[PDB]
Ligand binder design. Structure first.
Ligand SMILES: CC(C)CCC[C@@H](C)[C@H]1CC[C@H]2[C@@H]3CC=C4C[C@@H](OC(=O)CCC(=O)O)CC[C@]4(C)[C@H]3CC[C@]12C
Ligand SMILES: CC(C)CCC[C@@H](C)[C@H]1CC[C@H]2[C@@H]3CC=C4C[C@@H](OC(=O)CCC(=O)O)CC[C@]4(C)[C@H]3CC[C@]12C
Ligand SMILES: CC(C)CCC[C@@H](C)[C@H]1CC[C@H]2[C@@H]3CC=C4C[C@@H](OC(=O)CCC(=O)O)CC[C@]4(C)[C@H]3CC[C@]12C
Ligand SMILES: CC(C)CCC[C@@H](C)[C@H]1CC[C@H]2[C@@H]3CC=C4C[C@@H](OC(=O)CCC(=O)O)CC[C@]4(C)[C@H]3CC[C@]12C
Ligand SMILES: CC(C)CCC[C@@H](C)[C@H]1CC[C@H]2[C@@H]3CC=C4C[C@@H](OC(=O)CCC(=O)O)CC[C@]4(C)[C@H]3CC[C@]12C
Ligand SMILES: CC(C)CCC[C@@H](C)[C@H]1CC[C@H]2[C@@H]3CC=C4C[C@@H](OC(=O)CCC(=O)O)CC[C@]4(C)[C@H]3CC[C@]12C
Ligand SMILES: [K+]
Ligand SMILES: [K+]
Ligand SMILES: [K+]
Lengths: 258, 258
């Protein structure tokens, strides 16, 4: 039974959390959307009237301008941008700054992700375990060197070091990207958070503001290795925190054989 | 040691898989991109020359048309669209069809995701365990009713039923969305795959082709419950397959105390 009371509690929690989220996002964003849509509609009418642009030409121009936006960021599918795409696929960040235009590319993206996502999960899990083991050794050595009465490393110490490793990773990212992309520090930090949680809205995407995929190989290398290292650190902390809970239903189901 | 040979093998595998992906995506997509960019640049020059649009006006018109695209899909931040956004946040699908425009909305999106992602992972893990337990009971009852010499349910049977549950979920989604959105069956299937893996490029997004968030409450309800159920089924199968491997490094590290 207890497994069922737990799962029903988690479902009621998730739907309550969605309702609270929806109400707060509505409260924060709904007036800004309306004022922005009134401003955009006014400027649209202004320009369309100035040049007397025909409705069919304006529709075609909208289609052209929307489809041209992936191409303004330079060549996406040559090797560097194909590698950037593959990273966003198998990590499931999926910015969608470019996404495959052909049906063959779509089918390959599916078969590629089918094997790439498991491989990447097992890889980040193994690197996270190695990282946490190194941290626990290094903390034990520090505690011994500090002469503490016990060298033992408790879960609260691991959670403290995990939290400051995540904050440090996001601050280092925010500094690098706010320098390289000319974002504000807050927007670069938001970009780093949305990337390393793998949400990946793609409102902000690095390497796109110029021909940087072609022209800045060292910044491309940084962006790729920052993504892979940051995802490792964030997942290692997430696993450290939630692993006690992910296994409860199966532990109770095994004990229920008694 | 064996833990280290495993993690180094997984890193070399991941980078080889990225190189193979990048080379194949380049081979598939790079000629289509160039032919499309030549067509778009030609149509841009055509329209800009027909109306003699000034360069500054064309830049402003591009900005207007790009920022107007979220608003063409109807009101995003009223309750139904705020709920759709919150779903894409805490599941980490993150289509980015709408993303918070204010800095307050960005900060809340961060604090909201910090708690929402763990909660949702623990919820899908618990529902997946309950689902797999139900399946294993139901298969045992079927085998007993079929009069088989043993009622035991092997891992190959669970993997077979998991695979056909995932294929069935994607086919049901592809049929519903190809009917409701006027996509082809292949594009609706690609959309379902990219959604339930949580990649979420957002090239295809349901509920956006008209005022459907406001005008079609029953299709909004279907889309939300399809997302939550599909993510449950897909994660339950992924866990079933990879759980033997996710725990190897910690099992070896525990046994290494001997
Ligand atoms: C830490 C260990 C275990 C792995 C280290 C791997 C890195 C040294 C590799 C992984 C991916 C590589 C990058 C993959 C792609 C590119 C793009 C490449 O630029 C181009 O190819 C230009 C575009 C073109 O001509 O197609 C320059 C090298 C670079 C940055 C590579 C630099 C070296 C990187 C970062
Ligand atoms: C979800 C379905 C459709 C696909 C599931 C694929 C996984 C089950 C595969 C994909 C990549 C595989 C991994 C790729 C490489 C390795 C390293 C390999 O390491 C060694 O053999 C090192 C020597 C040793 O450990 O003794 C062990 C298996 C493992 C973890 C594999 C285990 C099985 C994985 C996770
Ligand atoms: C504080 C310590 C303990 C950890 C963090 C160290 C940082 C200060 C380092 C780590 C990696 C470094 C980055 C590695 C690569 C690049 C790309 C580089 O890009 C260019 O030079 C652009 C031109 C080109 O790529 O050709 C600019 C510096 C930067 C961001 C570096 C800035 C300093 C960083 C963030
Ligand atoms: C299976 C059990 C455990 C949970 C079942 C939950 C569903 C019955 C709920 C969850 C989310 C609900 C939806 C959340 C939001 C909306 C939008 C709402 O439309 C509007 O509010 C219009 C826009 C506006 O006026 O703000 C209509 C109901 C609907 C589809 C809800 C229908 C009922 C749903 C699918
Ligand atoms: C990553 C950091 C920043 C945040 C980590 C948050 C998690 C540790 C929290 C978020 C939601 C929590 C869950 C919300 C609800 C429940 C149901 C609750 O169920 C009951 O109490 C039912 C009665 C019983 O089981 O006896 C058990 C704890 C649990 C799984 C919680 C465990 C801890 C969770 C996963
Ligand atoms: C094959 C069996 C074992 C499992 C799958 C059953 C399907 C045939 C059902 C399950 C849920 C159904 C869907 C639930 C809700 C809707 C929304 C509904 O939308 C409208 O009617 C639009 C107008 C409005 O919403 O007001 C159209 C039917 C549809 C897609 C249904 C089509 C048939 C579906 C996919
Ligand atoms: K996206
Ligand atoms: K994701
Ligand atoms: K995503």
């Amino acid at each position: 039974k207890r497994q069922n009371v737990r799962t029903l509690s988690l479902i009621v929690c998730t739907f309550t959390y969605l309702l609270v989220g929806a109400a707060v996002f509505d409260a924060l964003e709904s007036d800004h959307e309306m004022r922005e849509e009134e401003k955009l509609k006014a400027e649209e009418i202004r320009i369309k009237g100035k040049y007397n642009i025909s409705s069919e030409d304006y529709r075609q121009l909208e289609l052209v301008i929307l489809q041209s936006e992936p191409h303004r960021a330079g060549v996406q599918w040559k090797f560097a941008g194909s590698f950037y795409f593959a990273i966003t696929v198998i990590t499931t960040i999926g910015y969608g700054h470019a996404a495959p235009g052909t049906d063959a590319g779509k089918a390959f993206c599916m078969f590629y992700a089918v094997l790439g996502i498991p491989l990447t999960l097992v890889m980040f899990q193994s690197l996270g375990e190695r990282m946490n083991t190194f941290v626990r050794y290094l903390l034990k050595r520090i505690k011994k060197c500090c002469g503490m009465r016990n060298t033992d490393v408790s879960m609260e110490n691991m959670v403290t070091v995990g939290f400051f490793s995540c904050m440090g990773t996001l601050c280092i990212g925010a500094a690098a990207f706010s320098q390289c992309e000319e974002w504000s520090f807050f927007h670069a930090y938001y970009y780093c958070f949305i990337t390393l949680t793998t949400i990946g809205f793609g409102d902000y995407v690095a390497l796109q503001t110029k021909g940087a995929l072609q022209k800045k190989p060292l910044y491309v290398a940084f962006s790729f290795m920052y993504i892979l290292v940051g995802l490792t650190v964030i997942r290692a902390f997430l696993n450290l925190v939630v692993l006690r809970f992910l296994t409860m239903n199966s532990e109770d189901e095994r004990r229920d054989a008694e």
